[PDB]
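Replying to the earlier thread about multi-chain prediction with a worked example.

Input:
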Amino acid sequence: DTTQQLSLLKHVLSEDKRPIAFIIAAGCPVSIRHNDAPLIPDVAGLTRKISDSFGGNPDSLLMKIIQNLKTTIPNPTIEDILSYIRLLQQIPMSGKIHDVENSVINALEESICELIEEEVNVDLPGNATPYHKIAAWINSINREHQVEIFTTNYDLLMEQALEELNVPYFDGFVGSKRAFFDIRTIEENKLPSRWSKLWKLHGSINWQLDKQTQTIWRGTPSKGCSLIHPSHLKYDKMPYLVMMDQLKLFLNQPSAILITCGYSYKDQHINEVLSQGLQTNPNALIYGLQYDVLENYQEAKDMALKRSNLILLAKDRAIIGKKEGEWKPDPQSSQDNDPLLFFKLGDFQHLASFLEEISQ
Amino acid sequence: DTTQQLSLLKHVLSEDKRPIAFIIAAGCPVSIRHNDAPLIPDVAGLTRKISDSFGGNPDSLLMKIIQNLKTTIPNPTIEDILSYIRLLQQIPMSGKIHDVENSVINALEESICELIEEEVNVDLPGNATPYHKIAAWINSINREHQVEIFTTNYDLLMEQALEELNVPYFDGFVGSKRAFFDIRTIEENKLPSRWSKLWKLHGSINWQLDKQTQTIWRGTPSKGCSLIHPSHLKYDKMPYLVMMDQLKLFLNQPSAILITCGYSYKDQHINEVLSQGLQTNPNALIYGLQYDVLENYQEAKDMALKRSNLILLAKDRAIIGKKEGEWKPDPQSSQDNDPLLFFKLGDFQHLASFLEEISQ
Amino acid sequence: DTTQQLSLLKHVLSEDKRPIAFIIAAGCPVSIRHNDAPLIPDVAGLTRKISDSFGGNPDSLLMKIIQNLKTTIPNPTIEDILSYIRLLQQIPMSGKIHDVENSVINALEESICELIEEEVNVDLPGNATPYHKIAAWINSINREHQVEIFTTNYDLLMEQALEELNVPYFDGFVGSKRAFFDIRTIEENKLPSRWSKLWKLHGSINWQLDKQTQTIWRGTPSKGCSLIHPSHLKYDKMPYLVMMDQLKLFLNQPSAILITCGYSYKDQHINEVLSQGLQTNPNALIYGLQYDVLENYQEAKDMALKRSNLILLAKDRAIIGKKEGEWKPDPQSSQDNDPLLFFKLGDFQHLASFLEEISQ
Amino acid sequence: DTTQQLSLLKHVLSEDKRPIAFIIAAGCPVSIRHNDAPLIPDVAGLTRKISDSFGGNPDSLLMKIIQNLKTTIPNPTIEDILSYIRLLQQIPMSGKIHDVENSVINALEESICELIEEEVNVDLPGNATPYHKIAAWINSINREHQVEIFTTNYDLLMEQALEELNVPYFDGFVGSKRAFFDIRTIEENKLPSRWSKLWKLHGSINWQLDKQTQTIWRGTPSKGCSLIHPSHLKYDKMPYLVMMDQLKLFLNQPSAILITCGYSYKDQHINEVLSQGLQTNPNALIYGLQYDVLENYQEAKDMALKRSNLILLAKDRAIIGKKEGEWKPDPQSSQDNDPLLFFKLGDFQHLASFLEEISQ
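Result:
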């Protein structure tokens, strides 16, 4: 598998007549090792650290909500929990469901948001991080089509790497003191070609909301961010639809390319927007790379089997245009014992190293 | 007032080098007289007829919700009620708020939907209805730019008038048996120029949902329609965002025109989308016409005072480019007693008559 | 005077085939009245408030430096004081001149910088400030040539007004977390035409310096800003030369316009750069407006008499192309007593009102 | 090493579709042998000859400044000394630091300037000097792109060689009696293509300043030159910024070439301007040649490792696009004893001989 797909990927990436896009999920931040431990424990960590923070006491409302959701959702996540409390606080839930916390739901969600901001407030150590390598690859060669990045994370690590290496980009906001979400440049879509475009689909930690005029602005991480939403907020104090429109518009461009690293296709909206974009333009390609085994990605299998221009690649098998194949007999593992054929190049560290090698 | 604004409106409408759009709200269906009574009692009717249907018994859940919402919302509407029950049923609301109806909320909302479908299932009597006059105006002269219609109503009266007079149009769906919501023609945006475009922002009664594949389709009015939503449904089994995108794209076209008849600017999403479109393109114009007095439209006043290309016209006063004016001294009323200066031409019947006169 | 010059100014400003620039000095912030007092006491205030802060004790080093400079400079300013301490700290000044403060010079300059940041850290009250009117004028009409602003102040009031009214602009820096001074866009000079350009010649309060890598970045006002320099810093951790190059390049454009409000032509570098630009392009025009009397502006008189395309206008007299004229006999003052002919329209409030009237 | 790099250099220099530039430092004047001694003892000579001129008496102010600077700067230079006295005389330094010389600092700096002018006032002996060979190469073949020379020296030897062989060039000044620094031709940048351009970044000995009008002019070497500054003078009576702008503008041209001979990269401003130019245009190339060993050039190593289009070549090793290589096994030295592999062609004499061979 390695030779042919790697060579084709090198040819398609090295060209400058095609757009290039990335999708960055929690896999990229967790791929950075710190003190022999993951830098950030991902979406699952933002769940069980929260669970352990409130202790084993069942009198706490959070644990009761957890055990209620296991009755319906076998594997609830922190995004679902945040959505559930946001739904509860949208109406005067004074019933027996929220009888214990007549008004402590707001305190609980504020505490959750504070803990999330505390945990996702880190910085890139040194200059050997994979984000620096990706930024170096982006700035290495001038390409006639812009490089776009879509991130579902809340961290500023990608921006830190882009700014350290002096890579210009436009994330949507314009201004210096309290940058306003400038809209008309977004659909004007004639910015200088050397600029990059970083879209934060799920918001970020530096976005804040002023309720006096009900307007959003990008600032600095302060005590309480009102745009930590995992795609759950009001209608268009909401830039989420604009970023989704930008992704859809990009996917409709001819000869489009896109790579997903660290994504597990567990979000319905992303999957359906990708399906609409792929069906709209048959020339669009997605070189999905999974760090986990293919057996654990059912939605990825459904997406690959329902579309023809989605070259899904996993650690063990692959789906190249609705047809499934496995690894051919090759000396992938030198050791005779346990001759597992694994695609070790799907890791974010290995992906960044590959991009650096292509840059050189 | 009458002469100058009417003459300017005649010039701008008679030209075929500018796009023309309409927004049709409950004012147009209520403007049709039937048995010396309104044909449909509008959004307020879909509220108090519902209230009277459940009787004066306070044990009913609907009345309890009504009196709960008056504690928060001084003037709750049927749209807000539908949204509130939809929010309640989105979570297992087994608390004291919904203790009376552990599972009767579904029955109550089904009954409400059935009554709504029963009341909004009528037909245009004769060929003298204003919709027929508007369709005749649309088909009278060939225009190089298409005529677009955005409707927040659920009725099929506009389609009935368009089909009776043989006016071709595209409402989004494609097919004959169970028309699927075709997307790619929508952003392809190169349909024949002689076709019209009717967008139903708030759905319609002939739209149905199949949960087996979770897909929407336009059919015939049957027992239970799942797309009666006043802009409250799932994410993109949802064409609402596509119609909103179409409205926004139209508003960005140069030298755009738009007329609101029967609209009270009481929906936040419509107002904010209109504001974004108007600020995006300064050439866009809105000739808002209000059947009610200007004093009862606070949102209209705010919209007119916050933008320069919104020529708001009311029964008594007007706001033409952020400046407010009143009716000049004219013999509007022949009778000496109560010399009220009222713009009687803002009614839907008078608007249709004016359009017919311009057509002739 | 009023009619002809005002009408010519209206014609030249209303056109969109010529570039427009502003120069904003302390006159604009002092023109805002607050509590029947100036909002900020200008460069003179940043001098005598400093003098009063250290008291009347002659043992203080600051007072000794003040009385030393009066021996050489009859009217020393805060800029000169800052330059003098910066020169002293550039070398190990252990002599009798700095014997009193062997190392307290750093503490004194840090205290001065802290007080300056404290005093210049304000916000625009309400929406009636002249900056809001100027921003409304800028965003009112689309012009094929960009509007440029050069500010010698440290305040963020202009940015506050621009962001409140949603006016896009580019101040040089690119990024979100710690915006780096992006250079290549600056001489690339092909940004979208709808964007404005705000150049801070004398730095600002949100600019900070990292000595670990010795790089500047635009952030938030923190404890200690290292780029408060009134044009006195290191060679090209210095964007001053880049902004000067941008001003010089703009002045060389054909049919250029520029207006100075609140400037007294007391800075040699600004005057000489303006002279070089004006001589380079004879088509460049400067409509200098002085709030003070012409007798108090010797450098302005020299500049006007040494160049032909500098239409200097003062409160009493004017110099239009090397020729000096006075106010013709007109009923400028209604009162018979003290018939002073004063151009009251040179004030920043009146200038903003005039710009708003031209916009309407 | 020799064959491949020499052949590539021959190809790139022989083409006339690319700009060519030189940077000339003290290595070129010292490379000329006179009486079995260096013609000029370089920057180090302009330091220790000055030190020996004032004798071993510690009562002299110059020696005291020398020993003061060794406390801070391990290797102070004559440029730093001149800057330090210029800083001292910029303020009334009447303290204990300058107590010994209340006003003798001016006399000391005048004596230093007189000695510098005396030592750098020589002429090219004969017609066999390398400058004559370089001028012959420049005039040998007509090139569509001009040849530019940037010199950090004060001598007129390059001009002497250019004038002896009748090579036209433009050094910035225009006129015959007292040539004024003409600016508008400099950015006009449409001089005849056959003319060369010689830029003196660090001034020269024939530049003089008239304080009556405070203007600079190129004349003849007289008693006291006021523009001997090693890049340390007033703001824009200063052409230094204009020459820097010219260098930066040249470096931004596509397919630019540049060769540094005799430069040790010990000036921060040159290095940072070169870095900005190289990053601005990735097509720009620098074929740095060092007469000294690579181990003695730390700034050169940092510059080479921080950029990809800087082909640094030294006597022993090389850095070609961020990658370091050494000399391959070749019979560089015929003698078996001490088989040192040294690039003897990096000398200025050998460089001129190589250029002459390429010309033939």
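Chain A touches chain B through 31 residues (CB under 8 Å).

Feel free to reuse this layout for your own posts.
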